[PDB]
Design a protein around this ligand. Structure first.
Ligand SMILES: [Cl-]
Ligand SMILES: [Cl-]
Ligand SMILES: [Cl-]
Ligand SMILES: [Mg+2]
Ligand code: NA
Ligand code: NA
Ligand code: NA
Length: 367
C-alpha cells in the first residue's frame, strides 16, 4: 500500500490531545482462544465493563466479528452501538485509525500494520482482517482517510496537542517495524501526519511488554502540556527500575515543542504480577500466536488508562495499595475528570495490553 499524495499537515490537520473533546470511542471485541483464556469469556466481560464505563461519559461503538456479534450485543448495554467487523484480534488502539482534526474538519490516518513485528516477531501469524479495520471504521462514519505505507500503531505514539510527540526507541526503531527507514525519516513522517514539530524519545517502554516492544502508552503519557505520568517503582531489584530511571533522566532533560521543561509525576506500578498456571491452562496453542506461559511478568501499569469526556478510565490490578494510589494520583492530576477504576483489568494484561490499548478516540469535529 502506498502513501496519500498529500499529508495531513499540508491540509491543516493535526492529532489533538486525548483529553480534547470526543464524539465517541471505538473498541473491538476479544475472541481468539490462543490469546484470551477460557474462550475469551473473562476478557469479554472486562471489555464490556470498560465500554460501559466509558458510555457514561460519551457514545461508544463496539465492533465484533461475524461470529461474535450476537454475543457482544447480549453482553453490552443497549446504549452502546454494536457493529459487525472482521478482525484478527481486538486492539483498536493499534489497528484502528489515528484521528486528526483541523480548525470536512476530521480525518483518520490508516497506518500500515504487521501485528507488532510481522512474520518473524509479531503476536500472531495473520493480520489480514486487521489491515482493513481502519478503512471500515472511517467508512462507517463517512470520515475521510489518509493512508500511510509505514507500519505504525496508535499505542506507540502520544501527543500533547501542542506539537510534541512522545515515543519509545525500543518500538519505533525496532527492525521488526520499519527497518527501511531512519529515525529522522520516521520523525519527518510523524510531523507530516500528526502535525507535530518535536519529539521526546524514551529509549525503552515497560518491562515485560514484549508483545509490542515497549509501546509508549504502557510506559509514559501526557497529563497536560508539559506534564507526564511515568510508570515507576522504587525497587532496585525489579528490571522495571532501570527502565524507569532512564526514562526519568531523559524526561528531566527534555523540552517540549513549545519550549516547556517536562514535569514528571510518578505513577507506581503494582507489586509484580505473574501469569498463573491456571490462567495459562485456559489458552489454546494452535501454532498461530505467541505462547502465554505461566510465570510471565505481566506488563501492568496504571499509565495505560483512557481519557474520555470528563472521565478517566483506569485499570485496577488487585494491589492493596497501588490501586488506590493510582486512583488518587489520577484524581489529583485530572481534577475536572471523574476517575473510574476497572477491576479485573488483569484479564486484559494477560493478553499483552490494557484499557488504553483497547480504545481509540474519535475527536469531535471542529466547526
Ligand atoms: Cl445500565
Ligand atoms: Cl502551560
Ligand atoms: Cl509469555
Ligand atoms: Mg491501518
Ligand atoms: Na511479559
Ligand atoms: Na513484538
Ligand atoms: Na514461577
Amino acid at each position: 500500500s502506498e502513501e496519500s499524495r498529500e499529508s495531513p499537515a499540508e491540509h491543516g490537520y493535526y492529532m489533538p490531545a486525548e483529553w480534547d473533546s470526543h464524539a465517541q470511542t471505538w473498541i473491538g471485541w476479544p475472541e481468539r482462544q490462543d490469546n484470551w483464556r477460557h474462550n475469551a469469556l473473562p476478557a469479554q466481560r472486562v471489555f464490556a465493563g470498560v465500554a460501559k464505563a466509558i458510555s457514561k461519559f460519551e457514545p461508544v461503538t463496539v465492533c465484533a466479528s461475524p461470529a461474535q456479534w450476537e454475543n457482544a450485543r447480549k453482553q453490552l448495554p443497549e446504549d452502546i452501538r454494536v457493529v459487525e467487523m472482521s478482525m484478527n484480534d481486538s486492539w483498536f488502539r493499534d489497528s484502528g485509525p489515528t484521528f486528526i482534526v483541523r480548525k470536512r474538519n476530521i480525518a483518520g490516518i490508516d497506518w500500515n500494520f504487521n501485528a507488532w513485528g510481522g512474520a518473524n516477531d509479531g503476536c500472531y501469524n495473520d493480520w489480514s482482517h486487521d489491515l482493513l479495520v481502519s478503512r471500515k471504521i472511517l467508512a462507517l462514519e463517512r470520515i475521510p482517510r489518509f493512508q500511510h505505507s509505514m507500519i505504525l500503531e496508535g499505542g506507540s505514539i502520544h501527543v500533547d496537542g501542542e506539537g510534541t510527540c512522545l515515543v519509545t526507541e525500543e518500538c519505533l526503531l525496532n527492525k521488526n517495524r520499519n527497518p527501511h527507514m531512519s529515525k529522522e525519516q520516521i520523525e519527518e513522517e510523524l510531523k507530516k501526519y500528526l502535525g507535530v514539530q518535536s519529539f521526546i524519545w524514551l529509549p525503552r517502554g515497560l518491562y515485560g511488554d514484549e508483545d509490542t516492544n515497549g509501546h509508549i502508552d504502557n510506559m509514559c503519557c501526557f497529563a497536560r502540556p508539559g506534564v507526564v505520568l511515568l510508570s515507576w517503582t522504587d525497587d532496585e531489584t525489579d528490571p522495571q527500575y532501570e527502565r524507569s530511571v532512564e526514562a526519568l533522566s531523559v524526561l528531566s532533560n527534555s523540552i517540549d515543542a513549545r519550549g516547556r521543561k517536562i514535569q514528571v509525576i510518578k505513577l507506581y506500578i503494582p507489586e509484580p504480577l505473574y501469569m498463573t498456571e491456571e490462567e495459562s491452562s485456559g489458552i489454546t496453542q494452535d501454532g498461530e500466536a505467541i505462547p502465554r506461559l505461566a510465570g510471565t511478568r505481566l506488563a501492568a501499569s496504571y499509565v495505560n488508562f483512557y481519557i474520555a469526556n470528563g472521565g478517566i478510565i483506569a485499570p485496577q490490578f488487585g494491589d492493596p495499595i497501588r490501586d488506590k494510589e493510582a486512583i488518587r494520583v489520577l484524581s489529583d492530576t485530572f481534577p475536572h475528570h471523574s476517575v473510574v477504576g476497572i477491576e479485573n483489568a488483569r484479564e486484559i494484561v494477560l493478553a499483552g495490553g490494557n484499557i488504553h490499548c483497547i480504545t481509540q478516540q474519535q475527536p469531535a469535529e471542529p466547526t
